[PDB]
Predict the structure of Vesicular acetylcholine transporter,Green fluorescent protein,antibody.
Amino acid sequence: RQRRLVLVIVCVALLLDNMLYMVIVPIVPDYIAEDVKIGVLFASKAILQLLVNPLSGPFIDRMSYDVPLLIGLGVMFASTVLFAFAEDYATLFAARSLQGLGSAFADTSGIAMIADKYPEEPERSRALGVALAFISFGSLVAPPFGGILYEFAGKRVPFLVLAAVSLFDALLLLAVAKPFSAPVGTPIHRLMLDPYIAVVAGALTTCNIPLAFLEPTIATWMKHTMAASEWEMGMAWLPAFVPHVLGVYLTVRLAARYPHLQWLYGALGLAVIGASSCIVPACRSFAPLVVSLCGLCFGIALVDTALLPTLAFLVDVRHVSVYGSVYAIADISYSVAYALGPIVAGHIVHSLGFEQLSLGMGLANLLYAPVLLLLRNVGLLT
Ligand SMILES: O[C@H]1CCCC[C@@H]1N1CCC(c2ccccc2)CC1
């Protein structure tokens, strides 16, 4: 019961955090208006994650997994409270940077706590799949409705309501966990010297590239090619939520009957992502584009659900069984992808065209797929 209650509290926090990172992208240009200046503002949450994760990683290994989560929740609450009262450039920049710092402190600690509370292989992937589903829901389904709510009630009251909800969740966590009631880990620099973790980091940073490079430069192409309407341009990623949860469930089911092929699922996911990315530019209608975007989210779910518990298993079987400096590496990879994306995607599209960036991303994803054969012999380690 205690494990189930704490998991729900952690999952709710991840749903609200990912919803806040997306609902502000369309709002910001209204209060600002030179296109380079706007790009740096958006790519500021991910930049601070690269500079803070190497420092907040080992800190989690030293003070368990409750205090960092509380600090992260407090920072995110403060960040939300300054967006409601923000109508300038510097204020929005500061709010986005605070969002990045809070994410860096609060995502790694939550994932590490989920990994630590479930030390058994059959029920670890099952617990991580729920968190992945919550993250995908918050990132995909909610911002469409937030955009509709903004045009009707403004941005002051909804952000205050979200901040109040986050504070209530933080208070619930503080009451349940009771952090104030009655080993030395492997250094992060030396952890990356393990050949079995560098390949996983490379796989994550390669798989997170299509979303980061396609989010800021897809609506313009859709408008210029299909003459899409506002509803078509807005409700594009919403029907992609069902394939993600289906893929997560399928991976969880398959990892319990054959508990040694955790590399095959990752390779298949990478190949599916590459094929979908290569197919995306060859769509001239709304439904084929929706299907091709559904395939990408289906592949991402497979890759994540296959490669997330593998890091915990490797740390258990080859290093000191402590987490927090290991998921910092995954956060660093995701952050570097999402920080490189929204500054150069538009320039690449302008200089080379939309039909070639997608081909390059698909080619990279396809080429990295056979690299995962190096994890073939894992599971025999003692
Ligand atoms: O890959 C994971 C690695 C770091 C932790 C979280 C990362 N991941 C980011 C994409 C997210 C997602 C969001 C929207 C649609 C599909 C998938 C799933 C989670």
Summary: The CA atoms of residues 296 and 310 lie 22 Å apart. The chain has 19 helices and no strands.
